[PDB]
RNA sequence: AUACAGUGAAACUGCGAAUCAGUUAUCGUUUAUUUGAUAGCAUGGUAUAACUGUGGUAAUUCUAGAGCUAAUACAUGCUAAUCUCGACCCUUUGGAAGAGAUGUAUUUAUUAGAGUCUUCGGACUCUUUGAUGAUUCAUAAUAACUUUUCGAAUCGCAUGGCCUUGUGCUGGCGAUGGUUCAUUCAAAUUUCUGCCCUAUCAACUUUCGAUGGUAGGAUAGUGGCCUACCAUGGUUUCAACGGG
């Protein structure tokens, strides 16, 4: 078959055995087959085929995944080999981004020369996915911190488009719509962690606007729910358990960062789903953050206490009782100062709020602080 | 690439051919270290010429302070030990009365440590402390009470330290250099200038003081406890005339 | 003064914090390159820059510390001193009048007087011909 | 050619790296013990 | 000595130079981008060089705009703009603030391109700002 | 010894190819080599040598042509994994649900680098760091830039063990390489004195650099080694300057 793929890539008679061409482009095979097949599809023309739209779609998905260099270059050659109208003004940007000399400012500058045409968006998203597929050890780091920061010079619609593009392979809304998810794949579970890292990178690069896309946010919630599902579905050989602990810590710290960075024009009226997911994360052990470096649990609770809007979805569950319990542990760590500041912020933002549930939460907080704030012996900072 | 202006404490004659062994690069300086060739050929005469010196080095036979080091021109100099399994011997090689290198004959439990004056101490990298002593033993992790011009007892089997030795009044010192070379004793007074020319001053039975620069001298030990058996019965070199006077007396 | 040139004069990398308020705008950098001296008040509360000076500039002093009498000050930041030392000759078996020229980069720490005795030491070579630096008049 | 010896040497390089690290970062702790002793002393 | 370099703006192209005793020096020619740094709170970013306005020893370089050390600049302002309005929540010193809608900033080069081959700017802020605006007034 | 196993020509690769004199400093440079520390893919492709051939050419260690095939030659490329806090238990010298932390090379900006109380035995809290004479020293943290450095696609002798006999997982001695620091060996400059005779040599150097200061370039670097800009210096009857 490798000799057959090489012979059909040498003899370039396309549209003669093109019956299962798009089916082979939608089917799976090895990498030695995939490189020769993408070379053959770039050697063809793809103007009139069985389905030229399906060929361009498989080219876009290959330039998305691509293993970050080789199929990215081959699919860029295929996309130029297709009907590449309004792309000869960006062929330099495409060749630079597919090449290993991808100066990111140069790629976003040649696209800023090819701008006001918007015919480079799918190629730029596939180049962003290729630059995001860098893996492990400090060269991947020096490339990823360049890529996620340099992609901020793009459209305000195309940023949410790239976020939804990351959302697509591991959204699973049809899996999580009924109750929760029930199927466990570690390879897609790692892509959830990659989406978590890319979303945290985009939030840290632009933490004012942050660009909320609702299906991407619900897919991040679905990834955290799959993490709690694996924790309840413990695989005690535990490579999956270590991967799930690596996914849930970064997932919680990323989901706290999006809310705590945007905090004004995001986190829409469907906050009850995130409150339900946080209730699922607290129903294991609500007081499991008694350390001073309590990451994202105390941050989400304190951000909900700080922003006065979130008290409704706070008092939906009994979550202020959980934060008061983690504060009212006996040997509590130096996060007790953040808990007392949370009591200060939640007094005039729940006891000066709506009486049905926010003043009820403030009454529960005052009843906690009357008989549980006794040991005030903070002999450290007088401030 | 040549020699014959060799340091004259090597017991080297003039009619041994022209060139002398050039000391290769190693632990010590050239002016105060003898190579294994001038040791094994014309210092204890276990060999005759360089061909058979190469034979008894590449016989896996010599072990300068714990390891083989097959190199003729290897500058194993001051305070090292040279063990040989055959001939039962360990040679701590030190200074003496006249200035040249006195051999010892050392047993095993004294031959399983040397000691070293520190040359400098710093902090190396990643927070780790940093000690280098006179032979290039750049050793990590000392005890924290580190001074400079200070003696550490190197375990010499595994290259760590086993004992620490400070320096102040009333603990022994031994000179390596100057006109007063190879001499012990430490009891007068501890004077220090700035810009050098200072010494821990040296005792005598007649209170004879020898003051040099402090780079040459370093601690052996304390009163009653030196950490090395000493050459030729604790050589202080009183006088040839006093030696003949003691000969006429006893 | 603050300038004599097209470029700018500034202590490199010893900068202030340009956001918060301090009443200096440049922390004038203290140093002493050795020799047991106490730091001069003109360096603690001075105004010049002088990259060849041993009290704010980054040059170091050690080695040959010598003395002599100032005779020439007409140059730019560099003065010539007179090591008026007597020599000996094997012919006459007497003493003779001898001196050589030694130039030294003067520092604006204390004033530049024609006639005083200086104590200057060997520095890393500041120029083509001058090798020492003024550490104290 | 992949031999029984080549992956043996690869395994030995792995073992040497992990043994050097698993001596070094423990010798750090046995230095920190003496530092803690002197900190309790002073 | 050896030959002059006189590196320019645009189209990065660097000679590979080995010199006396190892010490691989990067003889960069024709620098295109530059890493600059906020001098009062510490954020650095690669930033696209436009031009060189000032030379402190020879107005031949004010003519030909040759990149060297100690040459005052006006560069890009856009990645600092994107960080300035994308992480703040403010989306805005006062004379530094005056250089926002002008599309140009001001800084200085310290790393030698004929020696190190780098491209460094520090955003001048304070008496540096005062002296360099007085130098703009000295030119104009 | 059906991959190889002995010797092994050839060839590639690796390594090596006025003397000035005494005289200090290199906190102004690099430091090949030795030595000592030191760094958590059952392993891919070139592009060729020797050789086989076709010749020219009086001829050279002259060569072109094609067929070949090697790497410690050239050029790409990888595996969770460990240290903190550990509520609780069951007593710990633990094992624990998990709140966490993650190399190096270059460049810049910083920042840190400064008198009671007594089981008379004991405690009751007292200060952060390595120094020289001396630092923008040594070192640690963030931010990115790297025409992207390294973190072993290597070799010889044995090849032993664990038993779930896989064809697994392990494991010894040492040969080369390689990051950084130190050492050792060096270089290249630098402080102070000197030598041939002379006033029928008294003025010599800012000619087309003379001498400084400021920036820049060159530098392995201190440094007119040079560039421009600011200043008009500096040497000398002391035997200078010039000449023998």
From Swiss-Prot, chain A:
<comment type="similarity">
    <text>Belongs to the UTP20 family.</text>
</comment>
<protein>
    <recommendedName>
        <fullName>U3 small nucleolar RNA-associated protein 20</fullName>
    </recommendedName>
</protein>
<comment type="function">
    <text>Involved in nucleolar processing of pre-18S ribosomal RNA and ribosome assembly.</text>
</comment>
<feature type="repeat" description="HEAT 4">
    <location>
        <begin position="77"/>
        <end position="114"/>
    </location>
</feature>
<comment type="subunit">
    <text>Interacts with snoRNA U3. Interacts with MPP10. Component of the ribosomal small subunit (SSU) processome composed of at least 40 protein subunits and snoRNA U3.</text>
</comment>
From Swiss-Prot, chain B:
<dbReference type="Pfam" id="PF08071">
    <property type="entry name" value="RS4NT"/>
</dbReference>
<dbReference type="GO" id="GO:0019843">
    <property type="term" value="F:rRNA binding"/>
</dbReference>
<dbReference type="GO" id="GO:0003735">
    <property type="term" value="F:structural constituent of ribosome"/>
</dbReference>
<keyword id="KW-0963">Cytoplasm</keyword>
<dbReference type="GO" id="GO:0003723">
    <property type="term" value="F:RNA binding"/>
</dbReference>
<dbReference type="GO" id="GO:0005829">
    <property type="term" value="C:cytosol"/>
</dbReference>
<feature type="cross-link" description="Glycyl lysine isopeptide (Lys-Gly) (interchain with G-Cter in ubiquitin)">
    <location>
        <position position="171"/>
    </location>
</feature>
<feature type="cross-link" description="Glycyl lysine isopeptide (Lys-Gly) (interchain with G-Cter in ubiquitin)">
    <location>
        <position position="225"/>
    </location>
</feature>
<keyword id="KW-0832">Ubl conjugation</keyword>
<feature type="modified residue" description="Phosphoserine">
    <location>
        <position position="24"/>
    </location>
</feature>
<dbReference type="InterPro" id="IPR014722">
    <property type="entry name" value="Rib_uL2_dom2"/>
</dbReference>
<dbReference type="InterPro" id="IPR036986">
    <property type="entry name" value="S4_RNA-bd_sf"/>
</dbReference>
Swiss-Prot record, chain D:
<comment type="similarity">
    <text>Belongs to the eukaryotic ribosomal protein eS6 family.</text>
</comment>
<comment type="function">
    <text>Component of the ribosome, a large ribonucleoprotein complex responsible for the synthesis of proteins in the cell. The small ribosomal subunit (SSU) binds messenger RNAs (mRNAs) and translates the encoded message by selecting cognate aminoacyl-transfer RNA (tRNA) molecules. The large subunit (LSU) contains the ribosomal catalytic site termed the peptidyl transferase center (PTC), which catalyzes the formation of peptide bonds, thereby polymerizing the amino acids delivered by tRNAs into a polypeptide chain.</text>
</comment>
<protein>
    <recommendedName>
        <fullName>Small ribosomal subunit protein eS6A</fullName>
    </recommendedName>
</protein>
<comment type="subunit">
    <text>Component of the small ribosomal subunit (SSU). Mature yeast ribosomes consist of a small (40S) and a large (60S) subunit. The 40S small subunit contains 1 molecule of ribosomal RNA (18S rRNA) and 33 different proteins (encoded by 57 genes). The large 60S subunit contains 3 rRNA molecules (25S, 5.8S and 5S rRNA) and 46 different proteins (encoded by 81 genes). Interacts with snoRNA U3. uS11 interacts with MPP10. Component of the ribosomal small subunit (SSU) processome composed of at least 40 protein subunits and snoRNA U3.</text>
</comment>
<feature type="cross-link" description="Glycyl lysine isopeptide (Lys-Gly) (interchain with G-Cter in ubiquitin)">
    <location>
        <position position="37"/>
    </location>
</feature>
Curated annotation (Swiss-Prot), chain E:
<dbReference type="GO" id="GO:0005829">
    <property type="term" value="C:cytosol"/>
</dbReference>
<feature type="modified residue" description="Phosphothreonine">
    <location>
        <position position="33"/>
    </location>
</feature>
<keyword id="KW-0597">Phosphoprotein</keyword>
<dbReference type="InterPro" id="IPR022309">
    <property type="entry name" value="Ribosomal_Se8/biogenesis_NSA2"/>
</dbReference>
<feature type="modified residue" description="Phosphoserine">
    <location>
        <position position="95"/>
    </location>
</feature>
<protein>
    <recommendedName>
        <fullName>Small ribosomal subunit protein eS8A</fullName>
    </recommendedName>
</protein>
<feature type="modified residue" description="Phosphoserine">
    <location>
        <position position="98"/>
    </location>
</feature>
<feature type="modified residue" description="Phosphoserine">
    <location>
        <position position="44"/>
    </location>
</feature>
<feature type="modified residue" description="Phosphoserine">
    <location>
        <position position="94"/>
    </location>
</feature>
<dbReference type="Pfam" id="PF01201">
    <property type="entry name" value="Ribosomal_S8e"/>
</dbReference>
<feature type="modified residue" description="Phosphothreonine">
    <location>
        <position position="78"/>
    </location>
</feature>
<dbReference type="InterPro" id="IPR001047">
    <property type="entry name" value="Ribosomal_eS8"/>
</dbReference>
């Amino acid at each position: 078959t490798y000799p057959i793929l090489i012979r059909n890539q040498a003899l370039k008679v396309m549209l003669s055995i093109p019956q299962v061409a798009e089916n082979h482009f939608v089917d799976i095979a090895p990498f030695v087959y995939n490189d020769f097949k993408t070379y053959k599809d770039e050697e063809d023309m793809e103007n009139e085929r069985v389905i030229t739209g399906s060929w361009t779609e498989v080219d876009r998905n290959v330039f998305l995944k691509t293993l970050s260099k080789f199929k990215n270059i081959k699919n860029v050659y295929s996309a130029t080999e297709l009907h590449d109208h309004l792309m000869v003004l960006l062929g330099s940007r495409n060749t630079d981004v597919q090449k290993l000399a991808l100066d990111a400012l140069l790629a976003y500058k040649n696209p800023t020369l090819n701008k006001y045409r918007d015919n480079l968006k799918n190629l730029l998203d596939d180049t962003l996915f290729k630059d995001e597929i860098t893996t492990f050890l400090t060269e991947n780091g020096s490339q990823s911190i360049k890529a996620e920061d340099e992609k901020v010079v793009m459209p305000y619609v195309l940023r949410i488009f790239f976020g939804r593009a990351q959302v697509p392979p591991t959204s699973g809304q049809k899996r999580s719509r009924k109750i929760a998810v029930i199927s466990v794949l570690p390879n897609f579970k790692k892509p959830y962690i990659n989406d978590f890292l890319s979303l945290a990178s985009e939030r840290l690069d632009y933490n004012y606007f942050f660009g909320n896309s609702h299906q991407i946010n619900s897919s991040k919630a679905t990834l955290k729910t799959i993490r709690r599902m694996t924790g309840f579905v413990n695989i005690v050989n535990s490579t999956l358990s270590v991967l799930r602990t690596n996914f849930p810590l970064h997932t919680n710290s990323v989901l706290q960062p999006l809310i705590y960075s945007i905090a004004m024009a995001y986190y829409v009226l469907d906050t009850e789903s995130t409150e339900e997911v946080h209730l699922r994360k607290m129903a294991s052990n609500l007081r499991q953050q008694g350390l001073k470096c309590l990451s994202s649990v105390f941050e989400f609770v304190g951000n909900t206490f700080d922003w006065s809007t979130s008290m409704e979805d706070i008092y939906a569950v009994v979550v202020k009782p959980r934060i008061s319990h983690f504060s009212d542990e006996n040997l509590q760590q130096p996060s007790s100062l953040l808990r007392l500041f949370l009591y200060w912020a939640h007094n005039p933002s729940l006891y000066q709020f709506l009486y049905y549930d926010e003043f009820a939460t403030a009454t529960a907080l005052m009843d906690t602080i009357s008989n549980q704030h006794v040991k005030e012996a903070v002999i450290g900072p007088i401030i | 690439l040549k020699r014959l202006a060799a340091p004259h404490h090597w017991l080297l004659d003039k009619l041994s051919g022209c060139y002398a062994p050039r000391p290769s690069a190693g632990p010590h300086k050239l002016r105060e270290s003898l190579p294994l060739i001038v040791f094994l050929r014309n210092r204890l005469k276990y060999a005759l010429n360089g061909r058979e010196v190469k034979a008894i080095l590449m016989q896996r036979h010599v072990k300068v302070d714990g390891k083989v080091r097959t190199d003729t021109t290897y500058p194993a100099g001051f305070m090292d030990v040279i063990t040989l399994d055959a001939t039962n011997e360990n040679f701590r090689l030190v200074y003496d009365v006249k200035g040249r290198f006195a051999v010892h004959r050392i047993t095993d439990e004294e031959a399983s440590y040397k000691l070293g004056k520190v040359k400098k101490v710093q902090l190396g990298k990643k927070g780790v402390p940093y000690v280098v002593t006179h032979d290039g033993r750049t050793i990590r992790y000392p005890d924290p009470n580190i001074k400079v011009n200070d003696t550490v007892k190197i375990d010499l089997a595994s290259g760590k330290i086993t004992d620490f030795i400070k320096f102040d009044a009333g603990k022994l010192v031994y000179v390596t250099g100057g006109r007063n070379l190879g001499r012990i004793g430490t009891i007068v007074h501890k004077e220090r200038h700035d810009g050098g020319f200072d010494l821990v001053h040296i005792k005598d039975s007649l209170d004879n003081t020898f003051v040099t620069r402090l780079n040459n001298v370093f601690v052996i030990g304390e009163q009653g406890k030196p950490y090395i058996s000493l050459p030729k019965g604790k050589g202080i070199k009183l006088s040839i005339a006093e030696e003949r006077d003691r000969r006429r007396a006893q | 003064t603050v300038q004599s040139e097209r470029a700018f004069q500034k202590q490199p990398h010893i900068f202030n914090n340009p956001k918060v308020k301090t009443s200096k705008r440049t922390k004038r950098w203290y140093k002493n390159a050795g020799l047991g001296f106490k730091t001069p008040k003109t360096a603690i509360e001075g105004s010049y820059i002088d990259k060849k000076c041993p009290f704010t500039g980054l040059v170091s002093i050690r080695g040959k510390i010598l003395t002599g009498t100032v005779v020439s000050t007409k140059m730019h930041r560099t003065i010539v001193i007179r090591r008026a030392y007597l020599h000996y000759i094997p012919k006459y078996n007497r003493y003779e009048k001898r001196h050589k020229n030694v130039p030294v980069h003067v520092s604006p720490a204390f004033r530049v007087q024609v006639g005083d005795i200086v104590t200057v030491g060997q520095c890393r070579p500041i120029s083509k011909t001058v090798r020492f630096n003024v550490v104290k008049v | 050619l992949v031999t029984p010896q080549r992956l043996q040497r690869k395994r030995h390089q792995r073992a040497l790296k992990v043994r050097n690290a698993q001596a070094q970062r423990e010798a750090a702790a046995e230095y920190a013990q003496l530092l803690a002793k002197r900190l309790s002393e002073r | 000595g050896r030959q002059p370099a006189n590196t320019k703006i645009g189209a990065k192209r660097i000679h590979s130079v080995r010199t006396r005793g190892g010490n691989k020096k990067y003889r960069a020619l024709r620098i295109e981008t530059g890493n600059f740094s906020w001098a009062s709170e510490g954020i650095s970013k690669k930033t696209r060089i436009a031009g060189v306005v000032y030379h402190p020893s020879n107005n031949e370089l004010v003519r030909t705009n040759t990149l060297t050390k100690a040459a005052i600049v006006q560069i890009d302002a856009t990645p600092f703009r994107q960080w300035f309005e994308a992480h703040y929540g403010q989306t805005l010193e006062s004379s530094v603030e005056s250089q926002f809608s002008a599309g140009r900033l001001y800084a200085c080069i310290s790393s030698r391109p004929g020696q190190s081959g780098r491209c460094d700017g520090y955003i001048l802020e304070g008496e540096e700002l005062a002296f360099y605006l007085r130098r703009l007034t000295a030119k104009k």
